[PDB]
Amino acid sequence: PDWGYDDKNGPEQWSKLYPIANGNNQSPVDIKTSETKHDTSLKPISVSYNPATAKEIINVGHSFHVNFEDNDNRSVLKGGPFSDSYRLFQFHFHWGSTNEHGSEHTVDGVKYSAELHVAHWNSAKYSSLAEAASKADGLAVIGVLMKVGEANPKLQKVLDALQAIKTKGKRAPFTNFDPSTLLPSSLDFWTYPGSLTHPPLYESVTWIICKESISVSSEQLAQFRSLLSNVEGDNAVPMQHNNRPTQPLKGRTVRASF
Ligand SMILES: COC(=O)c1cc(S(N)(=O)=O)c(Cl)cc1S(=O)(=O)c1ccccc1
Ligand SMILES: [Zn+2]
């Protein structure tokens, strides 16, 4: 692809090929808690996932993705700022080259060591991800900040699966998994209108950022970094990082559910 995370094709150069990188609705952002506004219309988040929708784990070169069956509404996100249910599509992570900064979002300028994204599309209004993905109301992503510390045993199915998808394009079945198990105990959240965090950078995402973090150990993060961006047979190139810097708020308000 024409983009990545290296100095030659990374975030600071994505605007040349994707000019919306310099848009007014870009993600991630720093959440300044003193500036958030409470919206009394927000409802709690409700996640209702069916573990039989887990389908496949895929090495996509710059990251890896756990896909869910995309056929019906068996797994949905509801509540929060939404009127419509959104259909679970995938989850994935971002991480950094150091434990010091691997998240995408930051809170009061604090950088976490990784971030979980649980992505959904608006199957009430639209009929495919392809149709929804460029629409302002098309996508919803739950972000969870991951604080380095004790090993998180909830990650073990995912981490154990990585040995079968070492290089770019490899994939393997990944079944019987409810990714709400990866979320924090409480689903208190912030929300703002933003974008996918890598190309094509569409401004189509309602972000739901959990207030509570989850843990991850330094060795678990090293397992992400040990994934390889090259194809099989080519000299091994580790996926050392895949987190975008925070982007200007440009007048948006971050709403708080608490
Ligand atoms: C390869 O794409 C992704 O993995 C991804 C990542 C994000 S992220 N990182 O912003 O959560 C979103 Cl919202 C959504 C997507 S995605 O919906 O799967 C996507 C894919 C191709 C084009 C348009 C949208
Ligand atoms: Zn992401």
Numbering used by the authors: 3 to 260
Copy text from the publication.
The carbonic anhydrase (CA) family (CA, EC 4.2.1.1), consisting of twelve catalytically active human isozymes, performs the catalysis of reversible hydration of CO2 into bicarbonate and acid protons. Since it has been observed that CAIX isozyme is highly overexpressed in numerous cancers, it has been postulated that compounds inhibiting CAIX may possess the anticancer activity and may be used in tumor treatment. Here we have designed a series of compounds, methyl 5-sulfamoyl-benzoates, which bear a primary sulfonamide group, a well-known marker of CA inhibitors, and determined their affinities for all twelve CA isozymes. Eight crystal structures of CA complexes with compounds are presented in this study: 9a bound to CAI and CAII, 3b, 3d, 5b, and 9a bound to CAXII, 3b bound to CAIX and mimic-CAIX (mutant of CAII containing amino acids in the active site as in CAIX: A65S, N67Q, I91L, F130V, V134L, and L203A).
The structure of 9a was also determined in the active site of CAI and compared with the positions determined in CAII and CAXII. In this case, the results were somewhat inconclusive because two alternative positions of the compound were found in CAI. One position is partially similar to the positions determined in CAII and CAXII, and the alternative is rotated. The 9a is unlikely to occupy a well-defined position and had a weak binding to CAI (ΔGintr = −48.1 kJ/mol). Still, it showed a significant change in the enthalpy of binding (ΔHintr = −39.7 kJ/mol).
